[model samples]
Target: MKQRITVTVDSDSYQLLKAYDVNISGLVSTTMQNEARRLRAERWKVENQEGMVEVARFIEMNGSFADENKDW
Candidate 1:
């Protein structure tokens, strides 16, 4: 599903876009996708930081498991 909304740009920017005949919708969609992915990565790192720290602590206490002890 998709939703529509309005955006405001400076007159100079609008004129440059018009001169180039850029695809406004495509540009906006690409920009949104890049922004959303970056935001999701940041949020995931924040949410998992503590869990990762605990994992590291466990590894430090027990030592790492030996390889070739299990199937791939």
Candidate 2:
């Protein structure tokens, strides 16, 4: 499901972009998609930081599984 949202941009920038015939809808959608992904990824990283750190510590102590078999 898609929800409607309002976004405001600078008037001068909008006018400049309109002069160039820019696809505002596509640009806003793509930018929002990337922004949402970045925020979610950062949130996930912060939430799982302890686990990541522990895994790193384990690898430091026990080494990687690839250390057992890496020929390629």
Candidate 3:
């Protein structure tokens, strides 16, 4: 059997995934709940994906990440 991994999503992450069209149960799963911390970075990648879209839109309109990312 393929090992299934369970994961937990914090309320904000749950919301972000929801916004991104992911359906999660109870914001977490017991199988990997104890390993939640280990998964935060990937969750952040989800947020970064959203942020990238926003940044891309900003750049499309304004010509640079400095318009959104502001890092020059």
Candidate 4:
């Protein structure tokens, strides 16, 4: 489900947008997608860093089973 609410833009920004004939709703959605995705990705990488390092060390020491056991 999604929610909708009234929002404000910069005072002068709205006039410039119409001058250039931009799609306001699409612009707002795309801006949030890029910014919000980037923010979450940064947090995800930080939280997963320790587990990723542990797995890397494990594979390096033992080697990967698929590659080690493959005969071809």
Q: After superposition, how far is residue 28 of candidate 1 from its true place, in Å?
A: 0.6
For model 3, how does the per-residue alpha-carbon lDDT over 14-52 read when each residue is reduced to its tens digit?
668667766655445753576775666555454343333
Alpha carbon deviation, residue 15, candidate 1 (Å) = 3.2
Clashes of 1: 0
lDDT per residue (tens digit) for residues 1-72 in model 1: 977865666564854775688677577778887897777644544445344443334335334656545446
Can you rank all candidates by TM-score, best first? 4, 1, 2, 3
- Candidate 4 residue lDDT tens string, 1-72: 987744665565865785688577677788887897777644544445343443434335554455656458
Q: Per-prediction RMSD in angstroms? A: 8.6, 7.9, 15.0, 7.4
- Candidate lDDT scores, in order, read 0.62, 0.62, 0.55, 0.62
Q: Which stretches of candidate 2 lie over 4 Å from their true place?
A: 1-12, 41-72
Query: Candidate 3, overall lDDT?
Result: 0.55
Candidate 1 stretches with Cα past 4 Å from truth are: 8-12, 40-72
Model 4 scores what on Cα lDDT? 0.62
Better of 3 and 4 by TM-score: 4
Clashes of each: 0, 0, 0, 0
TM-score for each model: 0.40, 0.39, 0.23, 0.40
RMSD of 1: 8.6
Q: What is the per-residue lDDT of model 2 for residues 16-72, given as tens digits with 9 covering 90 to 100?
A: 675687677677778878887776644544445443443334335545345576559
